[PDB]
Write a protein that binds this ligand. Structure first.
Ligand code: NA
Ligand code: NA
Length: 247
C-alpha cells in the first residue's frame, strides 16, 4: 500500500503570527498504479491556518510536474486528484507536494494547531496530521510597594535582541527598525496585558507611557517566550509582574 509522510520545516521554536510555514507531503507511486481507480492527495488545516495556493508544487524525483492532476484549493486546504493513466510514467517513484500556509492572528499560544495530510485511493485511506505552535507571555502592571495595586493605562512596545520593534500588519507580525510602527500594548483595568503570537525567544518591553502618578521605567524589561510561557492545556501561566514607582 502506497505510504504517506507529512513534515513541517524548522518547527522547533514555533512560529510568529503572519509567518509562512513550509509543509510537505511525501508518497511513493505504486508499481501497479494502473490497477487503481482513485488516487488523491489532500490537506485540510485548522482555520488558524491559511493556504497560499500559489506555493503548491508537485515534484516527482526532483522534477516539477504540472499536468496529470486537477487541483482544488480552498482557504484552509487543497486536493490533488490525479489521473491514473498519467501516473504510469511515475510508477515506483517518490512524489512530494511542497506548499505553504500562513499562521493567522487568531492562532492561540500554546495550542496544537493541526493540518491533516491524506492519501485516498480506492483500496485505502492514509491520514497523517502535523502540529505547529506560537507562543506568548502575560504581564501585570503593579505598584512597587504593593503588588495588589494594579495599574491601568501603562503602554509598552516590544523589542527583540537586535533592537528592532514589533509591528502588526493585516496578517501578523514583523520586526522592523521604525519605532513609529511599533505595536502598542496597554494594561487594562486589572493592570493586565499580554503578548501573543511570537515564536520562542528573548524579547523586551519598553515602557513608552506611565500610569497617572507613576514614573517611566527607562530600563527595558526582558521576558522569555517558550512552550507553556502563556498557557498549559487551557490553564493560563502566571503573569510577569512589571513594577512602577510613584512620583
Ligand atoms: Na485520482
Ligand atoms: Na499566561
Amino acid at each position: 500500500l502506497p505510504p504517506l509522510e507529512k513534515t513541517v520545516l524548522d518547527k522547533q521554536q514555533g512560529f510568529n503570527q503572519g509567518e509562512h510555514i513550509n509543509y510537505q507531503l511525501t508518497t511513493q507511486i505504486p508499481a501497479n498504479i494502473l490497477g487503481y481507480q482513485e488516487f488523491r492527495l489532500s490537506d485540510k488545516a485548522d482555520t488558524t491556518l491559511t493556504l497560499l495556493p500559489e506555493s503548491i508544487e508537485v515534484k516527482v524525483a526532483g522534477k516539477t510536474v504540472t499536468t496529470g492532476y486537477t487541483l482544488t484549493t480552498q482557504k484552509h486546504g487543497f486536493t490533488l486528484d490525479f489521473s491514473i493513466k498519467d501516473l504510469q510514467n511515475f510508477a515506483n517513484q517518490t512524489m512530494t507536494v511542497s506548499y505553504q500556509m500562513r499562521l493567522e492572528k487568531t492562532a492561540e499560544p500554546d495550542t496544537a494547531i493541526n493540518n491533516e495530510g491524506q492519501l485516498v485511493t480506492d483500496k485505502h485511506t492514509l491520514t497523517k496530521r502535523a502540529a505547529v505552535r506560537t507562543g506568548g507571555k502575560s504581564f501585570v502592571k503593579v505598584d512597587s510597594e504593593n503588588a495588589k495595586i494594579t495599574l491601568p493605562e501603562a503602554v509598552f512596545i516590544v523589542k527583540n535582541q537586535a533592537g528592532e520593534y514589533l509591528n502588526e500588519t493585516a496578517n501578523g507580525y514583523r520586526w522592523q527598525k521604525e519605532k513609529a510602527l511599533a505595536k502598542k500594548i496597554t494594561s487594562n483595568q486589572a493592570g493586565e496585558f499580554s503578548v501573543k503570537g511570537l515564536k520562542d525567544g528573548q524579547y523586551f518591553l519598553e515602557e513608552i507611557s506611565a500610569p497617572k502618578g507613576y514614573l517611566l521605567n527607562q530600563t527595558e524589561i526582558p521576558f522569555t517566550v517558550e512552550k507553556n510561557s502563556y498557557a498549559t492545556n487551557g490553564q493560563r501561566t502566571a503573569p510577569l509582574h512589571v513594577i512602577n514607582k510613584k512620583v
